[model samples]
Target: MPVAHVALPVPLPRTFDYLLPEGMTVKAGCRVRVPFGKQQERIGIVVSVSDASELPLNELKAVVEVLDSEPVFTHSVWRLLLWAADYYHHPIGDVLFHALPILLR
Candidate 1:
């Protein structure tokens, strides 16, 4: 019953809760597909994992799939992004987008 606190490429200063589906060992730093606003689905980055959330578990969504076999950002890469986000106060989406190679964006 592990949960992933995911940060989307959206403007809100909050995260989405995702249930770790059966057979899915989704760890932090991985990418997961989640149910999002208004019946839509969003691809979000996994920030961390926990057993519960402030909201009801029924309100959350299970990860339908994973997007990458490994973390998209390495330890050093994550460090660099952390630095840039703190320095620029920019949206993490923008920071993550720019941090990746242009072809990958």
Candidate 2:
């Protein structure tokens, strides 16, 4: 099973993991819709993709939708934003979302 580490636009410091359903392919920096709370859905950025996850497979939720076929940010911008997140001690998810236009976000 493929897992996506997603950064949601919340203030929390960590990223959430979601399963990538069969036939769905998303790369880092792509936006994805995922289940957040019990009944709410949220958009998040795919920070990384991996085959292993900390949580059990059945315990994780599958990604609801993939918003982009390619990464939203260029390589240099992505690196800068990631660095800024770390340097500023802000949540990476929030940082990434802030880079987007209001309408796009």
Candidate 3:
């Protein structure tokens, strides 16, 4: 039962904060759901968590689900993502394609 501030796979920058679900636990690097705009929702990867948020409890979404129980990116892949974003000046989606196999790409 922890709160996580997370970045999603969307175009916009900045993170939204969500409360951990009633029966589940969450942490940084975990996948989470958050309200995006006007009652819409999205999946995000947890960046960090704290006791406080700029949003009110009524304004926040309860994380609807968790993805992998384990983090998807390996330590190396995590580092590579950061580096590729810097080196190529491209979005993560582009780098993801570069990393994927030909069939997947």
Candidate 4:
């Protein structure tokens, strides 16, 4: 019943918001994947969350998978990365992607 504004690995400057599926739990710093255009799926990081969506609930797509049992980074680190993204005028998605270890990326 929550909306997660996920930072996808793509180059877009906007967050790809999604609805959490029934009984699912997702929070900031979590890793998730969503259905992108056509048959492709995109991996993303959960940067922020909201209790409700601005759009009709029925119109929002649900997160397809949660990749982490726990968040990869602490909330503090999350905040720092987000701050860097904002200060540097870089896409948060790309910022998150660049922060990951080479093996993980």
Q: Is candidate 3 or candidate 4 better by lDDT?
A: 4
lDDT of 4 at 65: 93
Evaluated against the true structure, the overall lDDT of model 3 is: 0.64
CA lDDT, every model vs. true structure = 0.71, 0.86, 0.64, 0.81
- What is the C-alpha lDDT profile of model 2 across 1-105, one tens digit per residue? 799998666543477989999999999889999998889998999998988887998799999999999888888888888888988888798888988774255
- Model 4, CA-based lDDT: 0.81
Tens-place lDDT digits, model 1, residues 25-58: 8765567787776688777777668899878887
Q: TM-score of the candidate numbered 4?
A: 0.76
Off by over 4 Å in 1: 1-13, 86-88, 102-105
Off by over 4 Å in 3: 1-13, 79-105
| lDDT, residue 51, model 4 | 72
Q: Which ten residues in a row have the lowest lDDT in candidate 1?
A: 7-16
Highest-TM-score candidate: 2
Writing each residue's lDDT as its tens digit, candidate 4 over 4-104 gives: 88765664347877888888888788899898886788899988788766688778878999998888876777778888898888889888888877425
In terms of TM-score, which candidate is stronger, 3 or 4? 4
- Lowest-sum lDDT 10-residue window in model 4: 7-16
The best candidate in terms of lDDT: 2
**Backbone clash tally for model 1?**
0
lDDT, ranked from best to worst: 2, 4, 1, 3
User: Which pairs of residues clash in candidate 1, taking residues 3 or more apart in a chain or in different chains?
Assistant: none
